[PDB]
Amino acid sequence: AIHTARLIHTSDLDQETRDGARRMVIEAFRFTDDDWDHALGGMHALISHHGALIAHGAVVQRRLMYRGPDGRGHALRCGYVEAVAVREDRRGDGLGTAVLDALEQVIRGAYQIGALSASDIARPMYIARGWLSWEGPTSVLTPTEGIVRTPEDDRSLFVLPVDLPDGLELDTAREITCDWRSGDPW
Amino acid sequence: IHTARLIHTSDLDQETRDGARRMVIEAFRDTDDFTDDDWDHALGGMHALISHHGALIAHGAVVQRRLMYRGPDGRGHALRCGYVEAVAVREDRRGDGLGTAVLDALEQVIRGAYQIGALSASDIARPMYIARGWLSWEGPTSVLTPTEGIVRTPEDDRSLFVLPVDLPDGLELDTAREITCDWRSGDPW
Questions:
Q1: Do B113 and A11 touch (CB under 8 A)?
Q2: For chain A, what are the domain ranges?
Q3: Please, are residues A47 and A3 in contact by the beta-carbon 8 Å criterion?
Q4: For residue B176, what is the DSSP state?
Q5: Are B179 and B69 in contact (CB under 8 A)?
Q6: Helix H segments across A30-179?
Q7: Nearest-CA neighbor of A163 among A104, A111, A128, A93?
Q8: Is A74 helix (H, G, I), strand (E, B) or coil?
Q9: Taking CB atoms and an 8 Å limit, are B40 and A179 in contact across chains?
Q10: Which residues of chain B does A147 touch, with a Cβ-Cβ cutoff of 8 Å?
Q11: CA pair distance B189, B184, nearest whole angstrom
Q12: Angle of CA points B85, B90, B92, to nearest 5°
C-alpha cells in the first residue's frame, strides 16, 4: 500500500539492478567512481516502482576509532551510510525517510554505532531521528602518515549509538577517527 | 549434500545468533579461546549457516575490511576486502563436507561484493584452500595501527590466503610483497 525499502546485500544484486542503482544515484547526486565503490560491500535499501528504482541507500562496515580521557582506545564496529538518493521527480513523499528506516534497521541489528556525514542543511531531520551531531574534530588513520585531521567544513558527522562496549561512555566533543580508503574518507 | 544459508547479521534472530556464538566458541575450543573480540570480528556481514535437527552444525562469516597493498609503481591500494571469520564445524559432524558447503556460501558473497577475499588458516588447513583456488601470501603480513605505524605480524602460526575476484583494472598482485590489514581491536587477522 505504501512504499518501503527492501534490504539486499551487494552480493545478491544482479548486474541489471546493480547498474541501475549506480546510474540512479549518479543522476540524483548529479558522484565519482570512488563514491560508488564506497557504497558496495554491505546492505542496500532499494525502493522500486513502475519498472525503475526510485530511492536507494547503503550501509557498509567500517571501523571508528575513539580514545577517551581513559586512554583506552576503541575500534567500534560501524555501519556507515552511503549513497542515499531519491529520484528527482519523486521527492517530497517520504521516500528518503523510508530508506533511512531500513538502513537504521541494519545498523541496529549488526553494528555498534551508525555514522554518516551530512550538510548543515540536513541536521534537523537526522537529529529528530535520534542521531547525534559530532562536535569534536574528525580525522582519518592514513597508511602513509598517521592520523590526519579532516579539513573543517559545513559538513557534519552524525553517529547513532546502538551497542557500545562495556562502559565506553562517549564524549562527542573528543576526537573521532575513521579508517582509510581512497577518495572521500567520509 | 548439505547447503548453507546466507544471512546478514542484522537479519539474525536472537535464537539463531546465540547458538552461532555458542557453536563457534565450542568449535574453536582447541592459539587462544574464542574471546569477546573474536566474536565481534565475526559480526557485521554475511553468515553462512548449516543446521540439522534444529541445531547449528556449521558456521562461517565474511565481513568487510580494507587490505592495503603497494605495487612497485608506488601504488597505494586500499582494497575492498571480504574477510573470512569464524569458520566452525561441530566436532561430531566433521568429515561430511560441511566446511566445503560453508566456503561455497562464503565465496559467493566474496565474488559478488568485494575486490578480494582474505582469510587466515593453519598449516593443516592450507591444502583445503589451495585446492579451492586460494592464493597463499608469501610476503610479510602487517597491521596498520593508530599509535605505531605499520607493524609486522609474524608471531602467528597461521597463513594468509587471498581470493582475487574484482581487482582494480590495472592491478596484478605480487604475493611476494607486503600486505597490510586495517586496524581493529584484538586479533587483526
A1: yes
A2: 1-186
A3: yes
A4: T
A5: yes
A6: 33-37, 95-110, 123-128
A7: A111
A8: strand
A9: no
A10: 146
A11: 9
A12: 155
